[PDB]
């Protein structure tokens, strides 16, 4: 039909209007300076996104989750991880960075900003609830797993570089409180001291053999804790989950004054998110970053492999009806912002992820509309 | 009672929560740089305030205005202008700058950001409609009159300084297109050429006698047009008024897609306005700028003279019932932002206006609550 297409367009165009307004304000009309845009982006990331996430999570009911949908979403990621492990361990071309980038491209779409309105327009409010559950799972688990992988890579790099031969007998790690990351952007020095028994201890502070897995486990856990304790998204997710649990357990209603206090800043989340995405689009030197072959490979992976593995897993478990379609449409969404930020901070193929987010936001309307039409027959 | 007090507090606290959040982010937790705050303020002023004003104006019905309320609001300003004229012309202590500052302090409260929610909570939606009408009148007329006065002062200063003796016989003024203001922040040079008949013409370009009023009228009109053509508020007000007229004449409904496109950025108006006010509060070196005596004089004028002249005019015309109270409560609101911006750009007592806006926002809750209680007996 065409009325449903008009409803989908009505839902999706205002986001693009905000994006184009920001793009023109920076590129055509020359209104905002780069550092002013940085300040707007900082405000958005610190305030508008965490409050929107809190508002979405604290309304979701954790006692009415759809088990099979979560099972399919987890099964596709298990399939992807298995494929990556087999490719990396049993082929000379495999690498950890490529595995991380492929996992991010093929398994982490943008569900918060764009997924909820588009899926609500396409199928209804139950699709919105499913997107909320997916966002909750993504925030609690998959972002934590990405951080685990990034911290493991950083720790491996530090161990390999600092102790090419001495790292054989290391058993303990010490890190000062001033250390916040293992990216390498700062001056990290590890003093070494001989133990009484004969082993060697190392202390990490700010200015090819493997030790046993226990010490890496401890170090990675410490780093992951130190970075989760200083991230607004973790606080938003945890507080929202706890409040949702208690409120749907004891039917407790939040005070109206606190609700309005949260909403007065939560109401700016979607428009400011799209505006900041437009600012990011305008600040880039050119729309396509990596190049023709790399960009077409990334776009093909994002818009084909994700839907393909989603279909395989969904018919494998037994998803049927509109739910199945929802999964496929969820798989074809543009790639998320949080993995892009992670790739920027750890500098693991940031150009490919930037091409992903921006060009996917640009060309998701034709691709998602085509998916909707084909699944509509 | 106390339930009505709780409702008023519920309406007003979230604004202060946003303000305090911004103040702490800049002062306590040190999140935003001064230029990032400037970028946020620029975004707010360019986008969020004009769109909020457009949304409010385009919904108002211009065929159902309350004539007597507008008559009282205009009568108080006529009284103030008459008092200022008598004081300035017939006393050696009178001045134009003092008259402008007193008029701004005593006649221009903040009705858009704070007046509408507070008055809706206090008295109902009809109070909101009255505040919308007041905002429309303020945007169309009184801001234009302020600009007329400021441009007249600038033209007088330029004429007096450039031609202490030659300005007697000037008859025509020419201004190049690059000139945007008469503030003096730029290099303004006025070439003089002798006419064929014998008079002298002057051309203004960017690097005690009075001429007849026609030439000042022409020059001031040209400058006012050149500045109204480059102000988002004028476009917002004009387009909103035209759309409201046609839509309430022919019962035309705006397309839903355009409505959502406007609303996605209009929804951030109130929270971002309060956030920017908090940023302004945090960026100042100290809360009180002018000093103890000047601040107490300005605050006393704002919170006593305005209500007093409002009462005089309202009982003079014959306002009775809650409407009368509304006027008084409208007169005790904190002083507006647009006159403060005007005073900043023309540098006419900016410290007093800054003290006005900030300290009035701080202590309007006790004063307005006291007014509500006393008028409630």
UniProtKB/Swiss-Prot annotation, chains A, B:
Function of the protein: Acts as a component of the auxin efflux carrier; this activity is enhanced when activated by PID-mediated phosphorylation. Seems to be involved in the lateral auxin transport system. Together with PIN4 and PIN7, involved in the connective auxin transport (CAT) that ensures communication across the shoot system, and modulates strigolactone-mediated shoot branching control. Binds auxins including indole-3-acetic acid (IAA). Coordinated polar localization of PIN3 is directly regulated by the vesicle trafficking process.
Tissue distribution of the protein: Predominantly expressed at the lateral side of shoot endodermis cells as well as root pericycle and columella cells.
Species in which this protein is naturally found: Arabidopsis thaliana (Mouse-ear cress)
GO biological process: one example: auxin export across the plasma membrane
Residues binding (indol-3-yl)acetate: 49, 110, 112, 143, 337-338
Phylogenetic lineage: Eukaryota, Viridiplantae, Streptophyta, Embryophyta, Tracheophyta
Effect of residue 112 to A: Strongly reduced auxin (e.g. IAA) efflux carrier activity
Pfam families the record matches: Mem_trans (PF03547)
InterPro entries attached to this UniProt entry: Auxin_eff_plant (IPR014024), Auxin_Efflux_Carrier (IPR051107), Mem_transp_PIN-like (IPR004776)
Primary localisation category: membrane
Upregulating conditions: Down-regulated by endoplasmic reticulum stress treatment.
Outcome of substituting residue 265 to R: Disturbed oligomerization leading to reduced auxin (IAA) transport activity. Disturbed oligomerization leading to reduced auxin (IAA) transport activity
Topology, Cytoplasmic side: 27-36, 91-99, 283-296, 344-356
Similarity annotation: Belongs to the auxin efflux carrier (TC 2.A.69.1) family.
Keyword Membrane: yes
Activity regulation, per record: Auxin efflux carrier activity is competitively inhibited by naptalamate (N-1-naphthylphthalamic acid, NPA).
Disruption phenotype: Plants display defects in hypocotyl differential growth. The triple mutant pin3 pin4 pin7 is able to suppress partially the highly branched phenotype of strigolactone deficient mutants lacking MAX2 and MAX4. The abcb19 pin3 pin4 pin7 quadruple mutant exhibits an additive phenotype on strigolactone-mediated bud outgrowth responses and shoot branching control.
Result after altering residue 336 to W: Abolished auxin (e.g. IAA) efflux carrier activity
Swiss-Prot/TrEMBL keywords: Auxin signaling pathway, Cell membrane, Membrane, Phosphoprotein, Transmembrane, Transmembrane helix, Transport
One Gene Ontology term of the molecular function aspect: auxin efflux transmembrane transporter activity
Extracellular-side positions: 1-5, 58-69, 121-129, 259-261, 318-322
Protein name: Auxin efflux carrier component 3
Subcellular location: Cell membrane
Keyword Membrane: yes
Chain segments annotated as transmembrane: 6-26, 37-57, 70-90, 100-120, 130-150, 238-258, 262-282, 297-317, 323-343, 357-377
């Amino acid at each position: 039909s065409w009325h449903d297409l008009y409803t989908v367009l009505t839902a999706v165009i205002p986001l693009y209007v905000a994006m184009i307004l920001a793009y023109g304000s920076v590129r055509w009309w020359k209104i905002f300076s780069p550092d002013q845009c940085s300040g707007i982006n900082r405000f958005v990331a610190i305030f508008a996104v965490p409050l929107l996430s809190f508002h979405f999570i604290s309304t979701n009911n954790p006692y009415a989750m759809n088990l099979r949908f979560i099972a399919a979403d987890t099964l596709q990621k298990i399939i992807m991880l298995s494929l990556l492990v087999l490719w990396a361990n049993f082929t000379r071309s495999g690498s950890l960075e490529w595995s991380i980038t492929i996992f991010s491209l093929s398994t982490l779409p943008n569900t918060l900003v764009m997924g909820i309105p588009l899926l609500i327009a396409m199928y209804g409010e139950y699709s919105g609830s499913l997107m909320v559950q997916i966002v909750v799972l993504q925030c609690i688990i998959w972002y934590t797993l990405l951080l685990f992988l990034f911290e493991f890579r950083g720790a491996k790099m530090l161990i390999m570089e600092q102790f090419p031969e001495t790292a054989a007998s290391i058993v303990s790690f010490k890190v000062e409180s001033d250390v916040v990351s293992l990216d390498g952007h700062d001056f990290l020095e590890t003093d070494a001291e001989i133990g009484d028994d004969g082993k060697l201890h190392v202390t990490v502070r700010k200015s090819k053999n493997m030790p046993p897995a226990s010490v890496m486990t401890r170090l990675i856990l410490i780093m992951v804790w130190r970075k989760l304790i200083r991230n607004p998204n973790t606080y938003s997710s945890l507080i929202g989950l706890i409040w949702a649990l208690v409120a749907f357990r004891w039917h407790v209603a939040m005070p109206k004054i606190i609700q309005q206090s949260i909403s007065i800043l939560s109401d700016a989340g979607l428009g400011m998110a799209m505006f900041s995405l437009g600012l990011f689009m305008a600040l880039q030197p050119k729309l396509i970053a990596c190049g023709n072959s790399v960009a077409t490979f990334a776009m093909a992976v994002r818009f084909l492999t994700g839907p393909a593995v989603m279909a395989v897993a969904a018919i494998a478990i037994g998803l049927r009806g509109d739910l199945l379609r929802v999964a496929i449409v969820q798989a074809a969404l543009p790639q998320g912002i949080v993995p892009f930020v992670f790739a920027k901070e750890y500098n693991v193929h940031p150009a490919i992820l930037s091409t992903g987010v921006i060009f996917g936001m640009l060309i998701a309307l034709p691709i998602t509309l085509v998916y909707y039409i084909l699944l509509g027959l």
